[PDB]
Amino acid sequence: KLSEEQQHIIAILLDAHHKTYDPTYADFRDFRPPVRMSPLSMLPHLADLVSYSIQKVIGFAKMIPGFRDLTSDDQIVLLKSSAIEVIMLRSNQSFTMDDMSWDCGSQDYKYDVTDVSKAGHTLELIEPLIKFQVGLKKLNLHEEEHVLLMAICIVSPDRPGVQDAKLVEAIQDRLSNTLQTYIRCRHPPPGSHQLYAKMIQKLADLRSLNEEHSKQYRSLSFQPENSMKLTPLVLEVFG
Amino acid sequence: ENALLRYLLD
Numbered sequence A: 001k002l003s004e005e006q007q008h009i010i011a012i013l014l015d016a017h018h019k020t021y022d023p024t025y026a027d028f029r030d031f032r033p034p035v036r037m038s039p040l041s042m043l044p045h046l047a048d049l050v051s052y053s054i055q056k057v058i059g060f061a062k063m064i065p066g067f068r069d070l071t072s073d074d075q076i077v078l079l080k081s082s083a084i085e086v087i088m089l090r091s092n093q094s095f096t097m098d099d100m101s102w103d104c105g106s107q108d109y110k111y112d113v114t115d116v117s118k119a120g121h122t123l124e125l126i127e128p129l130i131k132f133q134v135g136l137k138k139l140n141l142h143e144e145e146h147v148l149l150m151a152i153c154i155v156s157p158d159r160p161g162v163q164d165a166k167l168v169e170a171i172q173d174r175l176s177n178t179l180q181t182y183i184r185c186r187h188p189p190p191g192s193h194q195l196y197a198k199m200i201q202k203l204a205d206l207r208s209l210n211e212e213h214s215k216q217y218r219s220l221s222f223q224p225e226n227s228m229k230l231t232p233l234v235l236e237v238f239g
Numbered sequence B: 001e002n003a004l005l006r007y008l009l010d
């Protein structure tokens, strides 16, 4: 059975996400206009979306039970390492199977493989990304599963530079144990079969995706001209 | 070092 503390946790994460994620995508107008005519024409638009998204991820993180206990340094480290992975995760909701693109309800905010390429990212990142999206979409997780995964990703003991591994591990365990218990009680066969293990595997794919992005990000970031198009937050977070 | 993150985390 789902313990009451576990049901509580789920309620909190769902709400956290509802506040942090806007289905309407109204806020997108505020970003620099998307340009699809021209190298890295997409980047200023795309860089603003990412910067926006980083903020939304930071807000979601704070709501997570026990995240507030961690030293400020340990909070910072967890956000810096996971922010790309979470953005990729949350981005699933916009991602459409039919067209293989991220659909933001409007033709102008629809995002395709060429758009991401127009950001200054090679197919090696891109092609694994699309594959991840498909593979995630196929799981067809409940909303409770989706929020829970993001929170378990955000709070990782392994992340480089962590001051207090043991305490971060304790907090993650509670959420993991909440997710396991939820699938068995709340998720029916045959969709329930292998779902925790499959979901865990997706965190591993994200780790690989994080490493690739980072290399690509540095070569992009290294050039002063491209670096000027990034937001201040993005520079600070992504380094 | 990091300022913007610290402010947002509170």
Ligand SMILES: C=C1/C(=C\C=C2/CCC[C@]3(C)[C@@H]([C@H](C)CCCC(C)(C)O)CC[C@@H]23)C[C@@H](O)C[C@@H]1O
Pocket: A046, A047, A049, A050, A053, A087, A088, A090, A091, A092, A093, A094, A095, A102, A111, A116, A119, A121, A213, A217
């Ligand atoms: C963000 C969100 C959205 C899309 C995410 C995308 C679509 C385009 C390609 C993106 C932006 C990927 C890029 C490879 C990111 C590159 C970032 C950078 C250029 C700085 O190195 C990662 C996530 C992808 C929109 C919405 O779903 C909110 C979500 O939160």
